[PDB]
Structure formats: structure tokens, C-alpha cells
Amino acid sequence: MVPISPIETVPVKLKPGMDGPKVKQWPLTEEKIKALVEICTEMEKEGKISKIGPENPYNTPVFAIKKKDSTKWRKLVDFRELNKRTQDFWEVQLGIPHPAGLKKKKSVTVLDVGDAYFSVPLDEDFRKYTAFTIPSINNETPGIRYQYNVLPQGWKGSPAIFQSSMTKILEPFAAQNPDIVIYQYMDDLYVGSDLEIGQHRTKIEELRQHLLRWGLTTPDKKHQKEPPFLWMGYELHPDKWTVQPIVLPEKDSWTVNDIQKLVGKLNWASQIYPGIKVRQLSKLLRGTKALTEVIPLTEEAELELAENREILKEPVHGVYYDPSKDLIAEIQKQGQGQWTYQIYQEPFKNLKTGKYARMRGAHTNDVKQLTEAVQKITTESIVIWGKTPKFKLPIQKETWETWWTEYWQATWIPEWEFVNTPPLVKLWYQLEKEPIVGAETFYVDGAANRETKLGKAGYVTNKGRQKVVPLTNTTNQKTELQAIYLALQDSGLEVNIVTDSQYALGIIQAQPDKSESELVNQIIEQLIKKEKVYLAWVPAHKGIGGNEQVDKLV
Amino acid sequence: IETVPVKLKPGMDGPKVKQWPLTEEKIKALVEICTEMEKEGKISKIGPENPYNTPVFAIKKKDSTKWRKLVDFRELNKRTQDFWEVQLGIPHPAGLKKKKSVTVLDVGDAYFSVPLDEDFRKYTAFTIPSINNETPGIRYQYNVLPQGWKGSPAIFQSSMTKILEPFKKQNPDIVIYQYMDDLYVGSDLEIGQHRTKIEELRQHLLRWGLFLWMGYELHPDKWTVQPIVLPEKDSWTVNDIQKLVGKLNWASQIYPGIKVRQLSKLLRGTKALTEVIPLTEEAELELAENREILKEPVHGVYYDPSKDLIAEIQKQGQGQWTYQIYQEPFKNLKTGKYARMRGAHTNDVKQLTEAVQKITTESIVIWGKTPKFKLPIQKETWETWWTEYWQATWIPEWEFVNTPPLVKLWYQ
Ligand SMILES: COc1nc(Nc2ccc(C#N)c(OCCC(C)C)c2)nc(OCCN2CCOCC2)n1
């Protein structure tokens, strides 16, 4: 007898003000009972459970379920009530590693623990709260009582305690073996090293003995799992990673759930397969509650999907992260508020890829979207590699300079360089900060009757030029935008425009290159065509001379 | 040696707050730091039975190369009960904002002696994250009074008094205030004498049992307040007068007797923007009267220790920033401007962060509490980059204004 160290139990409480589960034990068939009695018998023999007396008020229902209609039966206990009534644990399964963040190893091995798991004892004072009863045959006898001495399978607090304990155990062995690396997921431990393979095998052996010291049984034979590993949607080789292969379904009738699963597969494959376009398909899913309704593929969706299936034609591999080399992210504009990025170390070997869709605004510009994408990639890169990448961006230094210097908001991008890979991101117009000498002065106004939705838009100038246009089915904001649009249409290459609209000014100081409103876009095109434009504001109804409320208030 | 009883408000549970990503160097620094903090018993490793979490990160103070552990306690601070001590509240030293000079000192280490209430510790839990979620996040809890928590200065107040008893009596001129981990020392004396008395004070701190060798020099008497000014020109264009009228019309929301009539009348007809308009008698007189109105302070502006403080910040470009502190719209308790170039010349966010810091410190000196900020920055950008530039131990609440303000130039 070589002594094994005890595993410290984790104190557990029920949610305050509440108590444990009470549920009437469901009647079974004689068969199910006869199976469960044997199962619980040998479990009791192994120490996973124990027989208890009538003193325990708590009963959780126990079910029998045949395993694949074989000669074996298996126990299934429904803990949902206890889980509802049990406290919260800090769940350290928060997040999972991303393969791109890992460093390659010459050797990697899996150690399954389905043994050590039940070597982890439950808190003694909490044991009475897990209690199940096996109904005897015919109910002619008092049912058999049982309680858990270890972490039950499917209890709310099992994973956290399991992982905390396991970590506590692995702690010094990791510390005194700095030349290897370990990661724990579910029932599997993952060890890796750059050691010569024999040394690796003996290291794994040493780990197995180390777990044996706490009385944790390890397979004692060769493990059936070797690289590649299928893990959480990934195919993991020691020198490379990818996603478990993505194949786009060919169907004539595309339903809502079809495009749901399609955007799932695409958003999942986007991290590696570069240039995946989710836009048109996602737009077809907007506002659709019913999963059974077939929604016709737009002609903009088909040629997108045709590029998608030509992306997934031949698979591509991601590499691992080498801390000795620079970290770089490159961005491209795909148009339509979509951006595609690739994070790599050496050219054309990508650590990973990705995409960014614009936030939903009324208006927006390229530069803002580029900035937002940069922030996204930054945060992602801090999560994964722990540092901020070097950016290669489709924007001239000068453009960025003008933008951030003149922009009303504070804005920043980390260290970056201009890559010339069209389409380039640019500023489409720039408003003068001073009134233009020699340029005609257009005083514009618009107004609308709120009751009849009728109104007018127009302008008067210093050169005598005037216009007023009637508008039906329109609003004050609309008429006041239309006024400016008119002043832009009818004016030469340089123009000064006075407006009383805080709204129009509010829109134009946001410098959008695109908008939901075709009117605003028309104005944008107009500005783009212009040489110099000075937009000036005055308060309404203060009788500012030249601002004419009399023509459009009729 | 005896812990003072501490609890939360009724119905409010402990903070469960997401830990945001940290870079590698900050993770290293926090690992080393928490390692040395465990060996000193200030913190202790915890198990899965502790659900609560509070964010933690790393900074560097003024002109110092040593990393510092900053726990962001805001959620816990607002979830912890309003702590009214034996002090019955501090009658905040309005003499502090009147002082010729004020020095800010870091006393935080003094908190690490006093033990924390045994039952309250589960609410202080924080997590040192790992890169790429490869290893489980390391978890500690505080056995002592944590820096950044509202209850720490509250608890340590009574003993801080009897620590500072001889000094306050030896120097009846000097005013001493305490906010979070910082201690503010006001005086009417000279800079050199200030430095000497500060050295004596930190030695006095070292003798009473407690990086406290740092200090910050502020000058409330030289501090920035602003009135509203209108141009003085010998000739006005149509544009000049349009801007003027706009600004006056804006000021009318504040000052009662503003009249724009005679100035607006000049604009009559549609003139070109660059055309010069001579000022009439009525116009000039009206302008003069408006200036007269503007020279006076604002009628009946009162502070309310109950109500919130709000801080608006506008980017004026060229490193220039303007700001206002208020409670109700168009009542300004403080207004100012910040031009500082230090390390920030090419970076807007660094500037804005230093601006928020300065403004907050000012708020602390004047009213003894921090304002609620409205920042001219996208939530994503700020939230990404602010912790890199942050040198102060406290943190203010904030929000993000997405609409460009028209009033931007009216403060410039
Ligand atoms: C098992 O843990 C671990 N694994 C690796 N690499 C590594 C490389 C190849 C495979 C395969 N197949 C692998 O598989 C085991 C793990 C999982 C996630 C299935 C893991 N690198 C590390 O360490 C990288 C941590 N560094 C990141 C940069 O800062 C310093 C720390 N840790």
C-alpha cells in the first residue's frame, strides 16, 4: 500500500433563502429497476454512491436508459431541480483557446480522464442533497435509497470543481517541467513538447505517475487518439490547424433554417477561409421569424454563393504562432460595409482570417468602418496572442491625417502602414472652414405643413438667382435637405450655402460617403462634384437677413 | 486588529463582471505583483465556490517605470452600501479649492495593514487572465483593505485622523482632504516651502507605519475659469455677424437680457458672405449692452451635493480641448480649457484620457466627488484604448456622445 494524497473537497451551498430538490420518484418497469439495482450496486461497490436512511427528505428521480439497445443498461439522473436550487460557481470554461494562438509542438498527446473524475469527492455536507430512490418491484417494499459521494454527472457544480481540483493537481508538475505545455478540456488533458519523442513518452509517463500519486487512474495502455485531433470544430495537426471541412449544401429550395445554418457555417469558416461574404444571405434573414418559410435567393446572393463555393474549392491551412516573428494584420474593403482581414506572420501563411460588417447606421463613411474593424482586430489579437498586430491598411497616410485632424470625435489607430491594394479608402469631400471669396452665396430654406405633408424647398442668392419648388408627401427635415440639394445643383464649382437647419448641418458634419436616404446620397454626389463648399448656419426666425422663411412657409 | 463590519445594500448581490483582455506584459506584471502580494498575505487564492468577479489591470504612474495593479471597483462601489462613517460625512473642505497650491499624495499602502471584514471578502474577487485562455484564470481575494474601493478610505479614516493629528495642529494654515487612495494637501505657501513640508509629511507618514514618495503640484488659484467673449473688429462681414448672432442666441439660453435685433437687422436682404457691413448706432449699442451682460457671472448658480455632476468635453483640434462641468443645463459650476502636449501630440485618445484625468481631479478638489463624463469618442475606440494612458487610481463613470455638437466653436 503506497499512500495517496486526499483531494480537498469544495464547500458548496444551496441558493440562499431556498432549499434542496423534492420530486416524487417516477414508477418504472421491472426490467429498468432490475438493471438500475445492479448498476447502483456496483457503483456502491466502487464508492460512487451509498445507501441512506429515511431521515433524508430529498429525492431526485432516477431513470433507466438502454445503451444503443445493447445487452447493457445505463443510469440517467435528472438533476435540473437541484441545479436550479444550487448556487453559482465561477465557470472557468469561459472562453476556449484559438488554434492560431498556440505554438507548434514536435509531439502532442491526449490523456483521457474518466477515472480521476470520480476520484473527486463531493462536499460531505452537500452529499445529502443528491438523493435518489430505486422503486422496488411491485412497490411491495420500501424503495432503495441512495446518495452521492462524488461529483454527479450533470450536476451544475461538477465541471468547475473538477477543473479547479485538476488544475490544483497539475500545478507543480507544470512548474517543474517548464519544457512541456499542458491544457485541460472536459475529460481530456493535452500535453505537448519539442523534446525528442522518447523523452516525450517518458515525460507523459512521469505525468501519469504524478496523477497516480493522487490516486488518478490513467489508461495504462496506448491511447487511441493521436494527431490529428478533432476538437471543437477544428482539425488540429502538430504543425497546422484548420476547421473540420466545410461543404456548402446544394439545394433548389432555400428555407429560412437553410440560410441560418448557411450563415452559421460561413461565420464559422470565415476565421480561416478568407473573403467569405455573409451580407446578402444575412439580409434575407432579417425580420424572418418563421424557420419553415422558403425565401427566394436574390441575384446578388447567387453570384456571392458562387464565389463562396469557389473559395471552399481547395482547402487552406492556418499556421501556429511564432513569438519570435512579427505579427501583422491586413485589411481590404469588400464594399457594402463589408471588410475582410488576414492575420499572418510570414507572407501568405495566415495565422487566421476574418470579417467585419458595419454597424447599422442611417449614414456612415469608409474611414469610420476601417477604424472600427481595426479596433475589432486589435481586441481579438489581444485575446489570442496577447499583443497588438502591425496593420497594413488601404488608406494613404495623408488621408488618415486629414481625417483624424479635422474629425470632431477623438480617434486613434495603432501602428500601421499603407498598402496599395485597391479599392483605396478616401475622403470624398472637404468643407471649407471659411466663407469663400468670389463664390455665390445661396441662402436656402425648406418647410412643410405637418397636417397635409405639403411643403416647399428653395433658395435666394446675392446674385439674384432664386428658386422655390413645391413638395408633396414630405417633412421639415426632408424639405431642408432638398433645399441644400437644390443649392448644390444650381451652383458653380465653388459655393457658400447658408442654412437654418441644425438637422442638415448635423448630417453633413458627420461626413458620410453613403446613406440610407437617396436624398442625402444625392447631396453627397453633389459635394463630390464640387471644388470648394462652405456650409454656414444661422438660427431660424431671428430674422437673419437673406434667410427667407416667407417663400417656403406659404 | 479587529475588522469593522461591512455589508452591501438589501437585494443587491456581489459584482459579477467580465474581465477584459490584457496584453502579455501587463499579465506578467500582475503575475509578479500578485505573487508578492500573496506572500505578504494581502490576497489569497480562491476556489470555484466564489461566483463574483471584479476587473483588474496594470498601469504606470507619473514619471515612473514600475507597473501598478489597478482594480476597477466601480460596480462593487455602487453595489456596496452607502458608507456613512462615524464622521457623519465629511464637510468637504471648500478651503482646499481656495488655496494657492495643492499637492496630491498616494497613501494607498496604508490600507494594506487593516484586515478586511471576513464575510465581505468574496465580493472582492478578481481574475488574472491568461493569453488565449490556455490556462484557467488565476483568482485571488483580498484579506485587507483594497485600493480603489469606496469603503477603504471610509474605514481607514478614523485612524488616518490620529495619524495626522500632530501635523494638522503644528500647521493650522494647511488643509488636508482625502479621496480614495489619494490625500490632498492645500497651502498658501511658496513652492519650495511646499516641497519641504511635503517631504516632512511623507517622512511623517513613514514614521506612522507607511510608492508614497510621489507628489503632484496643482494651483487652484491659477486654475482655469472662463467667461464668454465676443470679437472686437473695426469692420464686420456678413459671415462675422451671422456667427456673432448665432453665438449670442446661444448665450441667451443662459444670460437673460441678450438682444439680437439690431445686429440681425444689418443682415437684411441677401448679401454675399464676405461683404463688409458697417455697424449702425443701434447695432453697436446693442453689442455693447450684450458685452455688459456677459461680464457678470451667471444668476443664481448653486451646487447640490445630492445631484450628479456632469462633464462635457469638446475637441477643438491642435491639441486644444474645452470642457464644462454642470448639474442642470446652462448652469455651469466650472468651465475650462486644456492644451497639454505631453507624449500626446499624435494621439487623440491619449489627450482625451489626460483631459478626463485632469477634469476629474479638479472635480475632486472642488466638490469632493467625480463627474459623469460625456466623451466625444466612439464607445469601441475609447473602451479599446483608454487603459494604456490611465495614470490615476480612481475611475469616473462615462458615456459617449454620438452627435456632433454645434456649440463646439462657441467655447473657442
Ligand atoms: C497544450 O498547451 C499548449 N499547446 C501549444 N501548442 C500546440 C500545438 C499543436 C497542437 C496540436 N495538434 C496542440 O494541441 C493540444 C491543444 C489543444 C488546444 C487541442 C497544441 N502551445 C502552447 O503554448 C503557447 C503559449 N504561449 C503563448 C504566447 O505567450 C507565451 C505563452 N500551449
Side-chain angles (χ1 to χ4, degrees):
Chain A
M1 179 60 178
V2 190
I4 64 177
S5 295
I7 292 185
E8 170 201 303
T9 59
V10 173
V12 183
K13 293 184 176 182
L14 293 171
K15 288 185 172 178
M18 294 179 174
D19 199 33
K22 297 173 184 175
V23 168
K24 161 177 52 197
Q25 172 57 56
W26 297 91
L28 299 177
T29 79
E30 182 170 354
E31 186 173 345
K32 290 186 174 185
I33 296 170
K34 282 178 175 175
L36 288 180
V37 171
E38 183 178 14
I39 293 185
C40 293
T41 296
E42 72 161 338
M43 283 185 64
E44 131 105 26
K45 290 180 178 181
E46 295 183 358
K48 292 157 188 167
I49 51 182
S50 291
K51 162 194 168 186
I52 58 177
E55 304 86 11
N56 220 282
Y58 309 98
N59 176 82
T60 188
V62 45
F63 291 107
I65 295 180
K66 235 186 178 69
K67 209 226 70 174
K68 241 46 68 187
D69 200 34
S70 186
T71 172
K72 309 195 59 53
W73 275 91
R74 218 55 202 83
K75 183 189 67 176
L76 168 127
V77 189
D78 196 22
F79 274 105
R80 298 208 296 267
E81 199 62 36
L82 179 55
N83 302 342
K84 268 161 168 283
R85 304 177 187 279
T86 314
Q87 69 164 91
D88 298 43
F89 291 87
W90 165 264
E91 296 307 315
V92 82
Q93 227 270 204
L94 241 145
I96 63 172
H98 194 284
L102 303 179
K103 186 180 180 185
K104 60 181 171 185
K105 292 306 167 192
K106 294 209 183 73
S107 314
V108 177
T109 315
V110 174
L111 271 176
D112 184 301
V113 284
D115 305 343
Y117 200 137
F118 290 86
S119 300
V120 181
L122 183 61
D123 178 34
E124 165 62 30
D125 290 84
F126 203 88
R127 296 189 185 187
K128 27 264 200 183
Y129 300 89
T130 57
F132 60 100
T133 303
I134 312 174
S136 67
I137 319 295
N138 291 116
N139 293 283
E140 294 183 354
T141 9
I144 302 185
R145 296 289 304 175
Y146 271 112
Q147 85 169 2
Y148 278 86
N149 299 334
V150 297
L151 292 173
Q153 45 257 256
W155 181 57
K156 184 186 179 183
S158 295
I161 296 178
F162 176 73
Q163 237 217 254
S164 63
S165 322
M166 197 58 59
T167 297
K168 281 185 175 179
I169 294 177
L170 305 186
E171 213 101 272
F173 179 80
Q176 287 193 320
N177 298 263
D179 65 334
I180 71 173
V181 292
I182 319 179
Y183 164 72
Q184 187 203 337
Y185 162 82
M186 301 286 186
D187 310 327
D188 301 320
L189 264 67
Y190 285 72
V191 189
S193 64
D194 289 328
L195 297 183
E196 284 166 349
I197 190 58
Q199 287 184 308
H200 179 99
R201 310 157 345 179
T202 45
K203 276 292 186 185
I204 300 300
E205 235 310 297
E206 292 179 350
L207 170 65
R208 298 195 51 249
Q209 181 197 347
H210 183 70
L211 288 193
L212 193 68
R213 286 192 177 185
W214 266 275
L216 310 188
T217 4
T218 39
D220 275 274
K221 55 179 178 58
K222 297 257 73 275
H223 197 258
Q224 305 301 314
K225 297 292 185 175
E226 77 171 59
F229 312 97
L230 299 188
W231 180 80
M232 303 264 71
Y234 302 100
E235 285 196 357
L236 305 90
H237 305 348
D239 59 325
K240 50 205 167 191
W241 75 279
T242 186
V243 289
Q244 303 174 19
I246 295 292
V247 180
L248 293 184
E250 264 230 356
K251 292 181 75 279
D252 243 32
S253 177
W254 305 84
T255 71
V256 161
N257 250 333
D258 287 340
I259 315 179
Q260 263 265 23
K261 269 60 180 296
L262 205 57
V263 83
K265 268 190 173 67
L266 288 176
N267 264 40
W268 178 249
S270 56
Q271 61 183 298
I272 179 58
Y273 290 107
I276 291 301
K277 294 183 176 181
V278 291
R279 173 67 165 173
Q280 326 282 16
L281 311 180
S282 305
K283 186 56 189 300
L284 295 176
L285 285 183
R286 226 184 187 185
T288 77
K289 237 56 195 303
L291 301 171
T292 48
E293 184 180 26
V294 180
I295 299 183
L297 237 70
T298 60
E299 210 72 4
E300 296 283 331
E302 213 295 280
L303 291 180
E304 176 189 77
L305 195 75
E307 296 178 22
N308 280 24
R309 292 153 187 269
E310 198 61 31
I311 282 181
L312 314 185
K313 183 200 61 172
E314 58 196 29
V316 198
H317 299 270
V319 289
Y320 283 134
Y321 174 58
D322 195 324
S324 63
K325 314 203 196 71
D326 239 318
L327 188 66
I328 304 166
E330 190 165 347
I331 319 189
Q332 301 87 24
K333 178 190 181 187
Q334 290 182 331
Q336 290 199 320
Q338 285 186 119
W339 302 81
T340 183
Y341 70 86
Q342 293 81 44
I343 312 178
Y344 65 91
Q345 285 194 274
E346 305 229 8
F348 292 110
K349 306 177 183 178
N350 289 345
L351 272 62
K352 70 180 300 297
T353 61
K355 55 177 174 52
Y356 177 78
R358 72 146 170 262
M359 291 182 54
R360 179 241 186 184
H363 336 286
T364 196
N365 68 31
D366 287 349
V367 177
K368 288 183 212 178
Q369 295 187 9
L370 178 58
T371 299
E372 295 169 343
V374 163
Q375 316 296 346
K376 178 186 185 183
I377 296 161
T378 292
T379 299
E380 201 190 55
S381 294
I382 296 188
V383 174
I384 301 181
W385 309 282
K387 78 160 179 168
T388 290
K390 289 186 175 188
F391 285 95
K392 289 181 179 176
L393 305 171
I395 180 171
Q396 300 281 3
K397 286 298 176 183
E398 203 164 0
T399 293
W400 179 249
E401 176 94 318
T402 293
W403 166 257
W404 83 267
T405 45
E406 292 298 332
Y407 188 37
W408 76 272
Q409 292 199 22
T411 201
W412 168 257
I413 293 183
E415 167 179 343
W416 72 277
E417 292 182 3
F418 163 64
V419 51
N420 173 25
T421 46
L424 296 200
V425 165
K426 45 166 298 185
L427 302 165
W428 293 99
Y429 58 95
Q430 290 184 227
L431 307 179
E432 297 275 294
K433 41 188 56 191
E434 294 291 339
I436 309 164
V437 176
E440 190 169 345
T441 307
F442 283 70
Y443 297 84
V444 318
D445 197 22
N449 176 268
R450 195 175 184 92
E451 300 287 345
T452 70
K453 303 212 65 172
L454 268 158
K456 306 179 182 177
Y459 62 80
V460 294
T461 94
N462 62 291
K463 247 157 62 180
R465 182 184 328 274
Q466 304 195 21
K467 175 172 301 188
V468 182
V469 179
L471 309 171
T472 72
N473 188 34
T474 192
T475 55
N476 269 269
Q477 292 171 3
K478 283 183 174 179
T479 62
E480 224 136 28
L481 288 181
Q482 188 75 50
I484 290 182
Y485 176 46
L486 279 168
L488 287 170
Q489 286 191 236
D490 306 337
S491 45
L493 280 178
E494 296 175 4
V495 58
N496 303 317
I497 301 177
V498 183
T499 160
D500 59 319
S501 181
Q502 303 177 4
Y503 171 84
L505 198 68
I507 284 190
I508 307 179
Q509 301 305 271
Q511 327 171 48
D513 46 42
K514 260 184 170 184
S515 180
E516 306 281 318
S517 159
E518 196 237 8
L519 185 51
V520 181
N521 299 295
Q522 246 137 18
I523 283 180
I524 292 173
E525 185 184 359
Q526 280 303 310
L527 292 160
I528 293 166
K529 293 183 181 176
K530 292 296 186 173
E531 296 281 79
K532 307 226 210 84
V533 172
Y534 174 75
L535 193 56
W537 179 88
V538 293
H541 306 297
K542 298 301 174 175
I544 271 77
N547 193 73
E548 229 63 285
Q549 202 76 41
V550 297
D551 281 346
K552 356 283 173 193
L553 268 195
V554 187
Chain B
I1 195 60
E2 195 64 29
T3 80
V4 19
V6 179
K7 285 176 301 180
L8 300 185
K9 304 179 185 182
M12 290 189 182
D13 196 17
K16 305 187 176 188
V17 194
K18 191 167 308 306
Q19 171 72 42
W20 59 73
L22 298 191
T23 72
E24 181 169 21
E25 59 173 2
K26 293 186 178 58
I27 284 174
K28 252 201 189 64
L30 287 179
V31 158
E32 188 162 342
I33 284 184
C34 286
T35 284
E36 314 312 320
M37 279 188 58
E38 174 157 43
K39 296 174 181 175
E40 294 181 352
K42 298 174 184 175
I43 52 182
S44 298
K45 308 283 285 295
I46 66 179
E49 78 278 3
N50 196 333
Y52 312 115
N53 178 71
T54 292
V56 49
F57 61 103
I59 60 181
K60 296 181 189 178
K61 274 190 170 296
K62 286 286 202 305
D63 295 309
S64 179
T65 46
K66 181 181 180 58
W67 291 98
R68 195 186 202 269
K69 172 191 173 195
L70 176 39
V71 190
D72 163 33
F73 267 137
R74 291 178 295 187
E75 190 61 32
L76 179 67
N77 276 340
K78 66 193 63 167
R79 286 187 194 270
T80 196
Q81 63 190 356
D82 320 326
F83 243 70
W84 52 276
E85 315 84 302
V86 194
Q87 68 159 8
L88 276 162
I90 173 175
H92 166 77
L96 182 64
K97 65 163 164 293
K98 302 174 175 297
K99 283 305 175 184
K100 296 277 297 179
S101 295
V102 164
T103 282
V104 191
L105 292 169
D106 182 23
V107 291
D109 302 274
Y111 294 112
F112 290 162
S113 63
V114 180
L116 179 57
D117 190 31
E118 179 58 44
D119 260 90
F120 191 74
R121 306 187 180 186
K122 78 176 74 66
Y123 299 139
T124 75
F126 69 92
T127 320
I128 298 182
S130 72
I131 315 184
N132 201 22
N133 300 286
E134 283 159 349
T135 55
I138 313 181
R139 321 201 80 232
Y140 301 89
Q141 81 177 4
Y142 266 87
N143 301 331
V144 300
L145 298 186
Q147 295 175 162
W149 183 52
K150 177 175 64 178
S152 299
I155 284 179
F156 200 80
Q157 181 184 7
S158 51
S159 50
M160 175 70 66
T161 330
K162 76 170 182 290
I163 283 183
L164 294 175
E165 282 292 344
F167 210 92
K168 297 179 71 173
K169 282 190 178 61
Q170 189 174 176
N171 306 267
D173 283 28
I174 302 183
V175 181
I176 291 180
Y177 179 60
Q178 189 187 23
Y179 188 81
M180 289 301 169
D181 306 327
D182 291 282
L183 198 72
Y184 300 86
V185 179
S187 64
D188 284 333
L189 310 180
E190 188 242 19
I191 289 186
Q193 316 290 350
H194 201 106
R195 290 185 180 181
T196 58
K197 272 296 178 179
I198 283 302
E199 171 60 37
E200 177 194 334
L201 181 53
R202 69 182 61 176
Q203 198 63 225
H204 193 285
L205 274 174
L206 195 75
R207 175 165 52 258
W208 266 94
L210 70 135
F211 22 75
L212 50 96
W213 66 274
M214 300 184 189
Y216 199 9
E217 277 218 14
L218 292 176
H219 308 279
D221 63 331
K222 319 303 269 294
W223 258 1
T224 164
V225 287
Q226 296 284 68
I228 309 174
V229 288
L230 320 171
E232 289 185 347
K233 310 193 190 189
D234 298 318
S235 70
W236 298 71
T237 67
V238 177
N239 181 79
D240 284 330
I241 305 173
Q242 283 178 215
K243 297 195 302 170
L244 171 66
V245 164
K247 185 179 189 173
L248 290 173
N249 175 75
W250 165 74
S252 63
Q253 290 176 112
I254 307 177
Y255 291 84
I258 302 296
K259 311 296 183 187
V260 290
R261 281 303 152 281
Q262 309 302 318
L263 287 166
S264 302
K265 282 187 179 177
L266 313 182
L267 295 179
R268 121 178 296 103
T270 84
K271 298 161 185 300
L273 286 200
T274 65
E275 178 179 325
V276 171
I277 313 305
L279 279 168
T280 71
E281 283 283 80
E282 303 86 351
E284 278 172 344
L285 175 58
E286 195 182 43
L287 183 49
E289 296 158 346
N290 281 316
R291 289 193 219 261
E292 300 285 276
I293 301 247
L294 289 184
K295 276 179 300 177
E296 293 173 64
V298 183
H299 170 222
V301 194
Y302 67 98
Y303 169 64
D304 190 12
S306 75
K307 305 181 183 76
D308 284 340
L309 285 177
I310 295 181
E312 291 191 316
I313 305 180
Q314 304 90 32
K315 167 188 173 190
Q316 301 287 342
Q318 316 158 68
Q320 311 239 283
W321 304 79
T322 51
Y323 72 93
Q324 308 79 36
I325 309 180
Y326 61 88
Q327 290 188 324
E328 311 289 343
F330 314 105
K331 304 295 180 181
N332 288 341
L333 313 174
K334 182 67 160 55
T335 82
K337 191 182 173 188
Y338 165 88
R340 288 294 285 179
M341 60 291 305
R342 25 186 262 260
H345 195 288
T346 172
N347 191 318
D348 264 353
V349 178
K350 188 168 182 179
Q351 296 198 15
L352 183 51
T353 286
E354 292 169 357
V356 171
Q357 244 141 173
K358 271 195 55 58
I359 296 164
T360 305
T361 291
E362 295 200 43
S363 283
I364 291 171
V365 173
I366 309 172
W367 308 275
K369 65 179 187 178
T370 69
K372 161 89 170 183
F373 286 82
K374 304 172 66 181
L375 312 181
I377 191 176
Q378 279 297 132
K379 172 174 181 175
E380 297 75 28
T381 300
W382 176 261
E383 229 176 348
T384 296
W385 297 109
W386 73 265
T387 63
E388 301 293 298
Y389 318 108
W390 198 270
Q391 306 183 293
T393 95
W394 32 252
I395 307 171
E397 311 293 333
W398 48 57
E399 48 179 312
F400 310 97
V401 32
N402 308 113
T403 305
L406 180 56
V407 306
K408 155 191 164 185
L409 247 177
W410 291 335
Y411 281 102
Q412 192 70 20

